[PDB]
Design a protein around this ligand. Structure first.
Ligand SMILES: CCCCCCCCCCCCCCCCCC(=O)OC[C@H](CO[C@@H]1O[C@H](CO[C@H]2O[C@H](CO)[C@H](O)[C@H](O)[C@H]2O)[C@H](O)[C@H](O)[C@H]1O)OC(=O)CCCCCCCCCCCCCCCCC
Ligand SMILES: CCCCCCCCCCCCCCCCCC(=O)OC[C@H](CO[C@@H]1O[C@H](CO[C@H]2O[C@H](CO)[C@H](O)[C@H](O)[C@H]2O)[C@H](O)[C@H](O)[C@H]1O)OC(=O)CCCCCCCCCCCCCCCCC
Ligand code: CLA
Ligand code: CLA
Ligand code: CLA
Ligand code: CLA
Ligand SMILES: CCCCCCCCCCCCCCCC(=O)OC[C@H](COP(=O)(O)OC[C@@H](O)CO)OC(=O)CCCCCCCCCCCCCCC
Ligand SMILES: CC1=C(/C=C/C(C)=C/C=C/C(C)=C/C=C/C=C(C)/C=C/C=C(C)/C=C/C2=C(C)CCCC2(C)C)C(C)(C)CCC1
Ligand SMILES: CC1=C(/C=C/C(C)=C/C=C/C(C)=C/C=C/C=C(C)/C=C/C=C(C)/C=C/C2=C(C)CCCC2(C)C)C(C)(C)CCC1
Ligand SMILES: CC1=C(/C=C/C(C)=C/C=C/C(C)=C/C=C/C=C(C)/C=C/C=C(C)/C=C/C2=C(C)CCCC2(C)C)C(C)(C)CCC1
Ligand SMILES: CC1=C(/C=C/C(C)=C/C=C/C(C)=C/C=C/C=C(C)/C=C/C=C(C)/C=C/C2=C(C)CCCC2(C)C)C(C)(C)CCC1
Ligand SMILES: CCCCCCCCCCCCCCCCCC(=O)O
Ligand code: OEY
Ligand SMILES: [Cl-]
Ligand SMILES: [Cl-]
Ligand SMILES: [Fe+2]
Lengths: 30, 62, 82, 34, 37, 334, 451, 341, 36
C-alpha cells in the first residue's frame, strides 16, 4: 500500500547514488 | 490475455530500471565500451519492442 | 592553524567512529521514542493527554487563579477528570 | 596521536545526544491519534 | 483513476512526479564524489 | 562631428557631476513629475474618495493633517484598475476627488525608479566596473512594484495599493494581515530574517573592521584621519579581526576572505527582500499564510486553542472593522 | 581534464555549467537531456493527476493543472465541461513519458560519450557564437518549428474536433471553429489595446475565433521570419547595437521568458476563455461578482426591490453605475464591473445589467453557477485551507488560478534578475573587465575630478 | 604561580572552543536557556496558564509551539523551582510557567556572559572592543522587552512568550493596545534596522563590483590573500560611481565602517526606550487635535482615525481569549463591526 | 582515518534528515494537529 509507494521511491532513490558508486569503483569518467 | 499484458508491462518496467543504471555506467567506463555497446544496442531495441507490445496489448484489456 | 584536536573530516570517515555510533545514535533515538510511547513524557511534564484537557461535560479551562494556592488548584482540576 | 576526549568532545556531545533523543520523541509523536 | 488494467501500478505512478528533483540532488552527490574540482 | 554625436557624448559623459545616460533621459522627467505632484498633493490636495463609497479621506496638511497622518490617498475603488490620467477627467476638481494624483505619482515613480536601476548598470559600464550593483537594487525596487502595482492588479483596484503616507502605510499593513495572515507566510518570515540579519551583519562588519583599525593617530584626533582617500594599504588588520571573531565563535564560523565576506553581506539582505517582495506579489493572488485555525482538537473534538487561534482573533477584529461602510455582502473576496 | 575543473576552465563548481560555453557537443547533451526532464514531468504529472482524478468532483477542487489544459483542447469533455472519457488524458500522459526516455537517452549520450565539440564532426551542426550568420540560421530553423506548432493548434480547432468553448450556447461544449478571424484590424487591435482596466491588452481575448485567427497570423509570421533569418545576415545597425556572445544570447532569452511569464500570470488570473472557469475555477473578479448576484437573487426572492434599494453609503445596495454610467453590481465588487462571463451576460442590456431581466429572466442554472463560483473564490492558505485568512479548517481548497498565477510570477521575477545578471556580465565580459578593474590602467584615475 | 594563575592558564588555553573566565557564566546559562526552550516546546503545555496547547506532544508545529508566560495570578514571581508556588515539584513547576522565568533569567545571564566573552577575547588578542559595544543593543532590546515591559505591567503573563506565533501575537497586541506603529521611538528603530539592511547590502555589492582584477579566473574569490597589504577593491572608483549616481559617496573607509556599527545599534537602542514607555502604558496612542476635530466633525476622516477603528476591533475581538483570567464576556451585540462583516 | 569516503557519509546523512523531516510533514496531516 504505502509501503508499496515507499519501496518504489526507495529503489528509485538509491538508483542515482548507485551509478556514481559503480563508476567510482570501476574508476570511471566521473 | 490479461496476465500477459501485465507481464509485458513489468518486463518493460524492469528493463527500464536496468538500463537507467546500465547506460550511464557503460557510457563513462571506456574500458569495456566495445563489450557493452552491443548490450545497449540490444536493450534499446528490446525496449522499443516492449513499448509497441504493451501499446497494442492495451487495446485488448482496456 | 590547528589548536590540536583531531580533524572532523578525519573522525567521521573513520571506521572506529561509525562502529561506535552505529549503536549510540539509534539507541538514543529509540530511547526518545520510548519516552513518548510509554506515556512517560505526559506524567513527567504534566501535559494533558487528548482525553484530559476537559471533563466530559465542561467547556471551561482550568486556569490557575491564585499565586500560592496554585499547585493546589491544578491538583483539584486533575482529580475532577476521574 | 590525537586526544579522544577534549573540551570540544564534551561540547559536541552536550548538544548532539539530547538532539537525537528529542528527534526520536518527536518522531513517535507523529503516530499519536486523538 | 488509471484504467483498471494499470491499477497495480498506482503506487509507482504516485511517486514518478518527484523524480525530476532527484536529478538536481544527484548532481550534488556527483560533485561530492569528484570533490567539487 | 554632427550635433547628434555631440548630444550622445554629453548624455553618456563620465564628466557630468551627476551621470545622465540614456536611462537618465527617461528617469529625470518622470522623477521630476512624480516629485512635484507628490509635494503639492501632500500639502494641498482636497479629500479623496479612496473606497468609492463617497466617503472622502483627508490626506493633506492644509486639510487637517500632520506629517504622521498625511498621505496622498489612493485612487477611488470605483475606478478599479482603469487608467485615469488628468485628461480623462471632466475637470481637475473631479480628478482630485477621485484620487487622480496617486496614479500620476506612482506610474511616473515606478518608471523613474526602474530607470534608476538601469542607470546604475549604465554608469558601471562607462566606468569599467563589474555590473551587479543594480541587481542589489532590484530587491527594494521589486518591493515597491509589489505594493504599488502587483497587489492592486491581483486585488483589482489601485484603492488597495499602499497609500503614500506614514499612517497610510500602517493601515495597509494591518488590513494585509487581516486578509492574508502575512505574519504566518514564510516569504515574509524570510524577509524578517533578511532585514534583521542584514542589520546584525551590518553591525558585525562595522564593529569588526572598527575593532581592528591600525593605530595611525593620537588620542586627541578622530581615528578617521588614519585613513586617506585613495591609499593603497588597508587601514585594518583582517587577520586580527579573524583571530578575534574566530575565537568568539569557532575558527571556521569566521571569514578570512574579504571577497567572500562582502559577497555574503550583499547576498543575505538582497535574497531576503526578494522573498518578501515575492511574498506580497503572491499574496496579491490570494495564496495566503499558513492557516492553523482549529488545527488541534481533543479526543472528544473540543477545539484546543493554540497561539495561531489567538492571532486569528486579532485578525478577525481587523477584518470586521476595516472599511466599515464598504461591504454589503458577507465575504470580503477582494 | 577537458574543463571539468576550475584550473583549466576558469569557473568554480558552483558555476560549472559555464564550462560548457564553448563545448557545443556537451552543451547539446545538456539541452537535450533537460528537455527530457520537461517532457518527463509533463507525462508523470498527467498520469499522477489521472490516478487521483475523481470525475464527480469539479477539476478545480482536485488540484489539477494539466488535465485542464487537455480538456481545453477538446479531449475527454462534453457539454458543460462534464468529463466523458478519461482515455485521452491517459494517452497524453503516456506518450510524453515514453518520449522523455528517448530524449533522455540522446542527452546522456551527447553529454557523456559523444564529441565534446561538434565543429570537427560536422560543419552543419557545429557553431561559433560569433558567427552571426550561423546564429540567425539556427534562429530561423526554430522560428519555423514554432510557426508549425502554432498551426497545429489551428489544425486541432478547424479539422480535428475543435476546442472547448465556454461561451458556446447551452452552457459550453466542444465546438469546431470554421471562421477564424483574419481581419488584421481585429487581430492586431488586441496588441494596441491599453493593458489597464476595461481593456486588458491581449488578455481580453474572449472568443475562440480570435484565438484561432491569431494563431494563423502568428504561424505564418514565424515561418516567414524563419525563412528571412535563414536567408539573411543581420544588418549593420543591428550589428553595432548588440553584444554577440553566448551569454548575451542567453540574457536576451531570459528577458523574453520573464516578460512572457508575467503575461501568463495575468492570463490565468483574468481570462476565462482559454482558461475556462469550468476547469480552473472562477476568476477573482468572477467570484466577487457571483457573490453580489447570489444575494441579489436571495433578497429579490424575499420581496426586495433590488433596483431601488439604497445602501448605507447612499449607493445602491445591489446595483449602481460605473463611472461611465453602465448599471453594475454594487458593494466592493464595483471594482470588478469589467468582468464578462457566460453565466452573467444574459442579464446584460445595452446600458449594463437590465433590471427587467433581473426581475424576470434569472434561471436556476445561473443561481447554481453563481453560488458555486462564490464558494470557490481563489482565496486560500498555503496549506490549502480554502477561504479568507480567518476561516477555520474544513475546506481543502486552493484555486488552480492561484497556484498558476503565483508560481509564474515567482518564475518571471527571477528570470528578470537572470536577464539583468547575464546582460550585465555579457557586456562586461565583451569589454574585458568582468573579472575586475585593471590596477595598472584604472579608468577613473584618468578622468578629471568631478569637483 | 598560585592556583588562581594556574586556573587562568587553563581557562585561556587556545582550543577549538575558547572558554575563558566568562565561559563559566556563559556556557551553563546559554545551554540551559536553549535546552529549556527545546524541552518546553517539545513536551510542555500552556493549558493551566493560558488555555493553550503549545508543544509538539500536543500536536503543535514549529510555528505554533511556545514556552508561554506564567499565569497572570503569579504576578512578577521569580517562580523558583524551590519557591513557594511549585515547592520543588518539577511537574507542577512546568504547569505553572516556571520554564518561562527559567529561560528568561538564564538567558539574561547568558547574554551578560556573551558580552564578557567579547571583552575577554578582544583583550587577549589585542583589538579594540567595538564588537562588545555593538552587542549592547541586543541586550537593551532583550531587557526592555522581556523584563522591563512585564515588570511595569500586572505580571509576567504579558511579556512575550518564547515562540514564533506567540511573538506574532505580541506584535498584534502592541498594535491594538499600544498603537506602537505610531511611536517615534519605534519609527527610529525601524529606520535603524532597514537602514542597516540597506548599508549591509549596498556595501557588499559595492565592494564586489569595484574589485581589482588580481587573478585570471572567472570566480573572483581566489584572487584575495588575507595577508596582502593592498585593498582588494577600488575606493576611488566606488566613490566616483556613487557620487554621480546618488550625489554623495563615502570617501573615508573608517567612517564608513563606523557608520555601519552606529546605524543599527542606535536604532535598537531607540526602540528599547519606547518599550520602556509602554511598560507604563505611556503610549503615543493619539493626536489630541485630531480627536477634537473628529469628535465635532463627522465628515473628518484621516488614515489616523481609520487605524484606531482597527485597533478597537483588535482589542474587543481578541481580549476574551488572550486574557482568559479576566473572564471577559462580550455579547455579540457589543462587538464592534462594520457593515456586513 | 578516511576509510569511508566523505561523499558517501554526506549522501547517507543527507538522506536521513530527508526522511525525518518528511515524517514530520506527514504528521501535519495525520493524528494530532491535523484538524481532523
Ligand atoms: C520592454 C517592456 C517595456 C514596458 C513599457 C510599457 C509598460 C506598459 C506596462 C504597464 C502596464 C502594467 C499595468 C497593468 C495593469 C493591469 O490591468 O494589468 C493586467 C492586464 C489585464 O487587464 C485586465 O484584463 C481584463 C480582461 O478580461 C476581460 O476579458 C476576459 C476574456 O475572457 C474575461 O471575460 C474577463 O471577465 C473580462 O473582464 C479586464 O480588461 C480587466 O479590466 C483588466 O484589468 O494584463 C496585461 O495587460 C498584461 C500586462 C502584464 C503586466 C506586467 C506586470 C508588471 C510586472 C513588472 C514586474 C516588476 C518587476 C520588478 C522589477 C525589479
Ligand atoms: C541593563 C542591565 C542588564 C542586567 C540584567 C539583569 C539580570 C538580573 C535579573 C533581575 C531580576 C529582576 C526581578 C525583579 C522582580 C520584581 O521587581 O518583582 C516585582 C516586585 C513587586 O511585586 C509586585 O508588587 C505589586 C504591588 O503590590 C503592592 O500593592 C498591593 C496594593 O495594590 C498590595 O498592597 C500588595 O500586597 C503590595 O505588595 C503587585 O502586587 C505585583 O503583583 C507584584 O508582583 O518587586 C520586587 O521584587 C522588587 C522591587 C524593588 C525594585 C527592584 C528593581 C527591579 C525593577 C527595576 C525595573 C522597575 C522599573 C520597571 C518599570 C516600571
Ligand atoms: C524569436 C524571435 C526573433 C528574434 C530573437 C529575432 C531577432 C532578430 N531579428 Mg527577426 N523576425 C522574427 C523573429 C525574431 N527575430 C520574425 C518572426 C519576423 C517576421 C516578421 C522577423 C523579421 C525581421 C526583420 C525584417 C529584421 C529582423 C532583424 C532581427 C535582428 C535585430 C532585432 C532587433 O533589433 O530587435 C528589435 C529592436 C528594435 C529596436 C525594434 C523596435 C523596438 C520597438 C521599441 C518596438 C515597437 C515595434 C514592435 C516591433 C511592434 C509593436 C508591438 C507592441 C504593441 C507590443 C535580430 C537578430 C533585423 C535584421 O538584422 O535582419 C537581418 C531586420 O531587419 N527580423
Ligand atoms: C538539468 C541539469 C543539468 C544538466 C543537464 C547538466 C549537464 C552537464 N554538466 Mg552541469 N551542473 C548542474 C546541472 C546540470 N548539468 C548543477 C545543478 C550543478 C551544480 C552542482 C552542475 C555542475 C557542473 C560542473 C561542476 C560541471 C558540469 C558539467 C556538465 C557537462 C558534463 C557532465 C559530465 O561529464 O558528467 C560526468 C558525470 C558522470 C559520468 C556521472 C553520471 C552522470 C549521468 C548523466 C547520470 C544520469 C543518470 C540517468 C538516470 C541516466 C538514465 C537514462 C537512460 C535510461 C537513457 C554536462 C553537459 C561539467 C562540464 O562542464 O564539463 C566540461 C563540469 O565540470 N556541471
Ligand atoms: C536538437 C536535438 C539534436 C541535435 C541537433 C542532434 C545533432 C546530432 N546528433 Mg543527436 N540525438 C538527439 C538529438 C539531437 N541530436 C536525440 C534526441 C537522440 C536520441 C534518439 C540523439 C542520439 C544521437 C546518437 C546516438 C548520435 C547522434 C548524432 C548526432 C549528429 C549527427 C546527427 C544526424 O545526422 O542524424 C541523422 C538525421 C536524420 C536521419 C534526420 C531525421 C532525424 C529525426 C529523429 C527525424 C524525426 C524528426 C522529428 C519529427 C522532429 C520533431 C521531434 C519531436 C520534437 C517531436 C549531430 C551532431 C551522432 C553523432 O554525434 O555521432 C558521433 C550519433 O551517433 N545523436
Ligand atoms: C553560571 C551558572 C549559573 C547561574 C548564574 C544560574 C542562575 C540562576 N539559576 Mg540556574 N543552574 C545552573 C547554573 C547557573 N544558574 C546549573 C548548572 C544547573 C543545573 C543543575 C541549574 C539549574 C537551575 C534550576 C533548576 C533553577 C535554576 C534557577 C536559577 C536562578 C536562581 C538561582 C538562585 O537563587 O541561586 C541561589 C544560590 C546562590 C545565589 C549561590 C550562593 C553562593 C554562596 C552560598 C555564597 C556564600 C558566601 C560566602 C561566605 C563567600 C565565599 C567567598 C569565597 C572566596 C570562599 C538564577 C537565574 C532557578 C530558576 O531559573 O527559577 C526560575 C531554578 O529553578 N537553575
Ligand atoms: C563561513 C560560514 C560559517 C558557517 C560555518 C559552518 C562550518 C563550515 C566550515 O567552513 O568549516 C568546516 C570545518 C572543517 O573541519 P576540519 O578542518 O575538521 O575538516 C577538514 C576539511 O578541511 C576536509 O573536508 O568543520 C567544522 O569545524 C565543523 C563545525 C562544527 C562545529 C560544532 C561545534 C559545536 C560547538 C558549539 C558552538 C560553540 C559555542 C559557540 C559560542 C557560544
Ligand atoms: C520513468 C520510470 C522509471 C525511471 C526512473 C528513473 C529515471 C530514475 C532516476 C532516478 C534518479 C535520478 C535518482 C537520483 C537520486 C538522488 C539522490 C538520492 C541524491 C541525494 C542527495 C543527497 C542526500 C545530497 C547530499 C549532500 C551532499 C552529497 C554534499 C553536500 C551536502 C548534501 C547534504 C546536500 C523506472 C525505471 C522506475 C520505471 C518506471 C518509470
Ligand atoms: C547530463 C547530466 C545530468 C543530467 C541528466 C538528465 C537530465 C538526464 C535525463 C534523463 C531522462 C529524462 C530519463 C528518462 C527516462 C524515462 C523512462 C525510463 C521512461 C520509462 C517509462 C515507462 C517504463 C513507462 C511505463 C508505464 C506505462 C507504459 C503505462 C503506465 C504505467 C507506467 C508508467 C509504469 C546530471 C545533472 C544528473 C549530472 C551531470 C550530467
Ligand atoms: C496568438 C493570439 C493573438 C495574436 C498575437 C499577436 C499577433 C502577437 C504579436 C506580437 C508581436 C508583434 C510582438 C512584438 C514584440 C516586440 C518586442 C517585445 C520588442 C522588443 C524590443 C527590444 C527588446 C529592443 C530593445 C533595444 C532598444 C530599444 C534600443 C537598442 C538596444 C535594444 C536593441 C536592446 C491574439 C492576441 C490576436 C489572440 C490570442 C492568440
Ligand atoms: C530545562 C531543564 C533542564 C535542562 C534541560 C536541557 C539541558 C535539555 C536539552 C535539550 C536539547 C539540547 C534538545 C535538543 C533538541 C533538538 C532538536 C529537536 C533539533 C531538531 C532539528 C531539526 C529538525 C533540524 C533540521 C533541519 C531543518 C529544519 C532545516 C535545514 C536542515 C536541518 C537538518 C538543519 C535541567 C536538566 C537543568 C532540569 C531543569 C529543567
Ligand atoms: C520547599 C522546596 C523543596 C525543595 C525541592 C528541591 C528543589 C531544589 C532543586 C535545585 C537544583 C539546583 C538549582 C540551582 C543551582 C544553580 C544556582 C546557581 O548556580 O547560582
Ligand atoms: O481589504 Mn478588505 O478586501 Ca482588499 O477590498 Mn475588500 O475590503 Mn477593501 O478596499 Mn481596501 O480592502
Ligand atoms: Cl480601513
Ligand atoms: Cl460587498
Ligand atoms: Fe567592508
Amino acid at each position: 500500500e504505502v509501503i508499496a509507494q515507499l519501496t518504489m521511491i526507495a529503489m528509485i532513490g538509491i538508483a542515482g547514488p548507485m551509478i556514481i558508486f559503480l563508476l567510482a569503483v570501476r574508476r570511471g569518467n566521473l | 490475455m490479461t496476465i500477459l499484458f501485465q507481464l509485458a508491462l513489468a518486463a518493460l518496467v524492469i528493463l527500464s530500471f536496468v538500463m537507467v543504471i546500465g547506460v550511464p555506467v557503460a557510457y563513462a567506463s571506456p574500458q569495456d565500451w566495445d563489450r557493452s555497446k552491443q548490450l545497449i544496442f540490444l536493450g534499446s531495441g528490446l525496449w522499443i519492442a516492449l513499448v509497441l507490445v504493451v501499446g497494442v496489448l492495451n487495446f485488448f484489456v482496456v | 592553524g590547528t589548536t590540536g584536536e583531531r580533524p572532523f573530516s578525519d573522525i567521521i570517515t573513520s571506521v572506529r567512529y561509525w562502529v561506535i555510533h552505529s549503536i549510540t545514535i539509534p539507541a538514543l533515538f529509540i530511547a526518545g521514542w520510548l519516552f513518548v510511547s510509554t506515556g512517560l513524557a505526559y506524567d513527567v511534564f504534566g501535559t494533558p493527554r487528548p482525553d484530559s484537557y476537559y471533563a466530559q461535560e465542561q467547556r471551561s479551562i482550568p486556569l490557575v487563579t491564585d499565586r500560592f494556592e496554585a499547585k493546589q488548584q491544578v491538583e483539584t482540576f486533575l482529580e475532577q477528570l476521574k | 596521536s590525537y586526544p579522544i576526549f577534549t573540551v570540544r568532545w564534551v561540547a559536541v556531545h552536550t548538544l548532539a545526544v539530547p538532539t537525537i533523543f528529542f528527534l526520536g520523541a518527536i518522531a513517535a509523536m507523529q503516530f499519536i491519534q486523538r | 483513476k488509471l484504467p483498471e488494467a494499470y491499477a497495480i501500478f498506482d503506487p509507482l505512478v504516485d511517486v514518478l512526479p518527484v523524480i525530476p528533483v532527484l536529478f538536481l540532488a544527484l548532481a550534488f552527490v556527483w560533485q561530492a564524489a569528484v570533490g567539487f574540482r | 562631428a554632427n550635433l547628434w554625436e555631440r548630444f550622445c557624448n554629453w548624455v553618456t559623459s563620465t564628466d557630468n557631476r551627476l551621470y545622465v545616460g540614456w536611462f537618465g533621459v527617461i528617469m529625470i522627467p518622470t522623477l521630476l513629475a512624480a516629485t512635484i505632484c507628490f509635494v503639492i498633493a501632500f500639502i494641498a490636495a482636497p479629500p479623496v474618495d479612496i473606497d468609492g463609497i463617497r466617503e472622502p479621506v483627508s490626506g493633506s496638511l492644509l486639510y487637517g493633517n500632520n506629517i504622521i497622518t498625511g498621505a496622498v490617498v489612493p485612487s477611488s475603488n470605483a475606478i478599479g484598475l482603469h487608467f485615469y490620467p488628468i485628461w480623462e477627467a471632466a475637470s481637475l476638481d473631479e480628478w482630485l476627488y477621485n484620487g487622480g494624483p496617486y496614479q500620476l505619482i506612482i506610474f511616473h515613480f515606478l518608471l523613474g525608479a526602474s530607470c534608476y536601476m538601469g542607470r546604475q548598470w549604465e554608469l558601471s559600464y562607462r566606468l569599467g566596473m563589474r555590473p551587479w550593483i543594480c541587481v542589489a537594487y532590484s530587491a527594494p525596487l521589486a518591493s515597491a512594484f509589489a505594493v504599488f502595482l502587483i497587489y492592486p492588479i491581483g486585488q483589482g483596484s489601485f484603492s488597495d495599493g499602499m497609500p503614500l503616507g506614514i499612517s497610510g502605510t500602517f493601515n495597509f499593513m494591518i488590513v494585509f494581515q487581516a486578509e492574508h495572515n502575512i505574519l504566518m507566510h514564510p516569504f515574509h518570515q524570510l524577509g524578517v530574517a533578511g532585514v534583521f540579519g542584514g542589520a546584525l551583519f551590518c553591525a558585525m562588519h562595522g564593529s569588526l573592521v572598527t575593532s581592528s583599525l591600525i593605530r595611525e593617530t593620537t588620542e586627541t584626533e578622530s581615528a578617521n584621519y588614519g585613513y586617506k582617500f585613495g591609499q593603497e594599504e588597508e587601514t585594518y588588520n583582517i587577520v586580527a579581526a579573524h583571530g578575534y571573531f574566530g575565537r568568539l565563535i569557532f575558527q571556521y564560523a569566521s571569514f578570512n576572505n574579504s571577497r567572500s565576506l562582502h559577497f555574503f553581506l550583499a547576498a543575505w539582505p538582497v535574497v531576503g527582500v526578494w522573498f518578501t517582495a515575492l511574498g506580497i506579489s503572491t499574496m496579491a493572488f490570494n495564496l495566503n499564510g499558513f492557516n492553523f485555525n482549529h488545527s488541534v482538537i481533543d479526543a472528544k473534538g473540543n477545539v484546543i486553542n493554540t497561539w495561531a487561534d489567538i492571532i486569528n482573533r486579532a485578525n478577525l477584529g481587523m477584518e470586521v472593522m476595516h472599511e466599515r461602510n464598504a461591504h454589503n455582502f458577507p465575504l470580503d473576496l477582494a | 581534464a577537458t574543463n571539468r575543473d576550475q584550473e583549466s576552465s576558469g569557473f568554480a563548481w558552483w558555476a560549472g555549467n559555464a564550462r560548457l560555453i564553448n563545448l557545443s557537443g556537451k552543451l547539446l547533451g545538456a539541452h537535450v537531456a533537460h528537455a527530457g526532464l520537461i517532457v518527463f514531468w509533463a507525462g508523470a504529472m498527467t498520469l499522477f493527476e489521472l490516478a487521483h482524478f475523481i470525475p464527480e468532483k469539479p477539476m478545480y477542487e482536485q488540484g489539477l493543472i494539466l488535465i485542464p489544459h487537455i480538456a481545453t483542447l477538446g479531449w475527454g469533455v462534453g457539454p458543460g465541461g462534464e468529463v466523458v472519457d478519461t482515455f485521452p488524458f491517459f494517452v497524453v500522459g503516456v506518450v510524453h513519458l515514453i518520449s522523455s526516455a528517448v530524449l533522455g537517452f540522446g542527452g546522456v549520450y551527447h553529454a557523456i560519450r559523444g564529441p565534446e565539440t561538434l565543429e570537427e564532426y560536422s560543419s552543419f551542426f557545429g557553431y561559433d557564437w560569433k558567427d552571426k550568420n550561423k546564429m540567425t540560421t539556427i534562429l530561423g530553423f526554430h522560428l519555423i518549428v514554432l510557426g508549425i506548432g502554432a498551426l497545429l493548434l489551428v489544425a486541432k480547432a478547424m479539422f480535428f474536433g475543435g476546442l472547448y468553448d465556454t461561451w458556446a450556447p447551452g452552457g459550453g461544449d466542444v465546438r469546431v471553429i470554421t471562421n477564424p478571424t483574419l481581419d488584421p484590424r481585429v487581430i492586431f487591435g488586441y496588441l494596441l489595446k491599453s493593458p489597464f482596466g476595461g481593456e486588458g491588452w491581449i488578455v481580453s481575448v474572449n472568443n475562440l475565433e480570435d484565438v484561432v485567427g491569431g494563431h494563423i497570423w502568428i504561424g505564418l509570421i514565424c515561418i516567414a521570419g524563419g525563412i528571412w533569418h535563414i536567408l539573411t545576415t543581420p544588418f549593420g545597425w543591428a550589428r553595432r547595437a548588440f553584444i554577440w556572445s553566448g551569454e548575451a544570447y542567453l540574457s536576451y532569452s531570459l528577458g523574453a521568458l520573464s516578460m512572457m511569464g508575467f503575461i501568463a500570470t495575468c492570463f490565468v488570473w483574468f481570462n476565462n476563455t482559454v482558461y475556462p472557469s469550468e476547469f480552473y475555477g472562477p476568476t477573482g473578479p468572477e467570484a466577487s461578482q457571483a457573490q453580489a448576484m447570489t444575494f441579489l437573487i436571495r433578497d429579490q426572492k424575499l420581496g426586495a426591490n433590488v433596483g431601488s434599494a439604497q445602501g448605507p453609503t447612499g449607493l445602491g445596495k445591489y446595483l449602481m453605475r460605473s463611472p461611465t454610467g453602465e448599471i453594475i453590481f454594487g458593494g466592493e465588487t464595483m471594482r470588478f464591473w469589467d468582468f464578462r462571463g457566460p453565466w452573467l451576460e444574459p442579464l446584460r442590456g445595452p446600458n449594463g445589467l437590465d433590471l427587467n431581466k433581473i426581475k424576470n429572466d434569472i434561471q436556476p442554472w445561473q443561481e447554481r453557477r453563481a453560488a458555486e463560483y462564490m464558494t470557490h473564490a481563489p482565496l486560500g492558505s498555503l496549506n490549502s485551507v480554502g477561504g479568507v485568512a480567518t476561516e477555520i479548517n474544513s475546506v481543502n481548497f486552493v484555486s488552480p488560478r492561484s497556484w498558476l498565477a503565483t508560481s509564474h510570477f515567482v518564475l518571471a521575477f527571477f528570470f528578470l534578475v537572470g536577464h539583468l545578471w547575464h546582460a550585465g556580465r555579457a557586456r562586461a565580459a565583451a569589454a574585458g573587465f568582468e573579472k575586475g578593474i585593471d590596477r595598472e590602467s584604472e579608468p577613473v584615475l584618468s578622468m578629471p575630478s568631478l569637483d | 604561580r598560585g592556583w588562581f594563575d594556574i586556573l587562568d592558564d587553563w581557562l585561556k588555553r587556545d582550543r577549538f572552543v575558547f572558554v575563558g573566565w566568562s565561559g563559566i557564566l556563559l556556557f551553563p546559562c546559554a545551554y540551559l536557556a536553549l535546552g529549556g526552550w527545546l524541552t518546553g516546546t517539545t513536551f510542555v503545555t500552556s493549558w493551566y496558564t493560558h488555555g493553550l496547547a503549545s508543544s509538539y506532544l500536543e500536536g503543535c508545529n514549529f510555528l505554533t509551539v511556545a514556552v508561554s508566560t506564567p499565569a497572570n495570578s503569579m504576578g512578577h514571581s521569580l517562580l523558583l523551582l524551590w519557591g513557594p508556588e511549585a515547592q520543588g515539584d518539577f511537574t507542577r513547576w512546568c504547569q505553572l510557567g516556571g520554564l518561562w522565568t527559567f529561560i528568561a533569567l538564564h538567558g539574561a545571564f547568558g547574554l551578560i556572559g556573551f558580552m564578557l566573552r567579547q571583552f575577554e577575547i578582544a583583550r587577549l588578542v589585542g583589538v579594540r572592543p567595538y564588537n562588545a559595544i555593538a552587542f549592547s543593543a541586543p541586550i537593551a532590546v532583550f531587557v526592555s522587552v522581556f523584563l522591563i515591559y512585564p515588570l511595569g505591567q500586572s505580571s509576567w503573563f504579558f511579556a512575550p512568550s518564547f515562540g514564533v506565533a506567540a511573538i506574532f501575537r505580541f506584535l498584534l497586541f502592541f498594535q491594538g493596545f499600544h498603537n506602537w506603529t505610531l511611536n517615534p521611538f519605534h519609527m527610529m528603530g525601524v529606520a535603524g534596522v532597514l537602514g542597516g539592511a540597506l548599508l549591509c547590502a549596498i556595501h557588499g555589492a559595492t565592494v564586489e563590483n569595484t574589485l581589482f582584477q588580481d587573478g585570471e579566473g572567472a570566480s573572483t574569490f581566489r584572487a584575495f590573500n588575507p595577508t596582502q597589504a593592498e585593498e582588494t577593491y577600488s575606493m576611488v572608483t566606488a566613490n566616483r560611481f556613487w557620487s554621480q549616481i546618488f550625489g554623495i559617496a563615502f570617501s573615508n573607509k573608517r567612517w564608513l565602517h563606523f557608520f555601519m556599527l552606529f546605524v543599527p545599534v542606535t536604532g535598537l537602542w531607540m526602540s528599547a526606550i519606547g518599550v520602556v514607555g509602554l511598560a507604563l502604558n505611556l503610549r503615543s496612542y493619539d493626536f489630541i487635535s485630531q480627536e477634537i476635530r473628529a469628535a465635532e466633525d463627522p465628515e473628518f476622516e484621516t488614515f489616523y482615525t481609520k487605524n484606531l477603528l482597527l485597533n478597537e476591533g483588535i482589542r474587543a475581538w481578541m481580549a476574551p481569549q488572550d486574557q482568559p483570567h479576566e473572564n471577559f464576556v462580550f455579547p455579540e451585540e457589543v462587538l464592534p463591526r462594520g457593515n456586513a462583516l | 582515518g578516511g576509510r569511508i569516503p566523505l561523499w558517501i557519509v554526506a549522501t547517507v546523512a543527507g538522506m536521513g534528515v530527508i526522511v525525518i523531516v518528511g515524517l514530520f510533514f506527514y504528521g501535519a496531516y495525520a493524528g494530532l494537529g491535523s484538524s481532523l
